[PDB]
Amino acid sequence: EEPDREKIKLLTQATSEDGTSASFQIVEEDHTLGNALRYVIMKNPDVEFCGYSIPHPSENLLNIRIQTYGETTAVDALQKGLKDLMDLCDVVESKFTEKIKSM
């Protein structure tokens, strides 16, 4: 049982006590998913602040930061955004399939 845990990492030096504010650090990412995910987290009506930041371009590290209002922690806003981007790639893949089957 070896799941990978060096991918996503909660930076505890910038995380609030309640969990309503937290910063993360994904390895091996950049503007690709850093901007596509930031778009979908900001569509949650409880996310007060969201943004990604690449600390240096020469290494593959991606700090994102979610701050909420209340009744949803900043981890629960990350995994709600990751679910709605999984569901957003299903809509693109299934519309683009139906237009190849229609030609």
Binding site: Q13, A14, M42, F49, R65
Partner: protein
């Protein structure tokens, strides 16, 4: 340097932070040079209007609490300067937010009245964009330059 006496003098006597003013006349020698100059004449312009997704992205793009840039451990933002049609932040209001976050919270804001290098007639009739104004740490008037 190879001992602790010399490390205490490359941090406290010859570091770059204490070398902000040169002793020749007391003039500063450290600042942003070519294209960060020509970007602050567009960012702090009066045409700049950022939306909510964009405004929060330019804050965290430059101010990271994890690397110890903040003073509050929670990035604080401002109300938008336009409410009713569509909420929009001004580009001068980003310079307010970055000074709100990197300055210590117990001290009050800065207060400054200065000038630019750009004359008022390049901006149109009755512009006041030559006058730089900071009131309680808020940029309220004027673009930012080499000056």
């Amino acid at each position: 340097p190879q001992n602790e006496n010399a490390r205490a003098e490359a941090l406290n006597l010859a570091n770059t932070d204490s070398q902000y003013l040169t002793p020749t006349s007391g003039s500063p020698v450290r600042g942003l040079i070519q294209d960060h100059i020509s970007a602050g004449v567009w960012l702090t312009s009066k045409d700049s209007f950022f939306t909510r997704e964009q405004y929060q992205q330019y804050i965290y793009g430059c101010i990271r609490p994890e690397d110890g840039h903040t003073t509050r451990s929670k990035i604080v933002t401002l109300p938008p300067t336009i409410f009713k049609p569509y909420p929009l932040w001004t580009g001068k209001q980003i310079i307010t937010t970055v000074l709100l976050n990197v300055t210590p919270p117990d001290m009050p804001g800065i207060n400054l009245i200065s000038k630019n290098k750009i004359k008022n007639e390049y901006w149109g009739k009755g512009s006041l964009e030559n006058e730089v104004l900071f009131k309680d740490g808020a940029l309220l008037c004027g673009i930012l330059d080499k000056s």
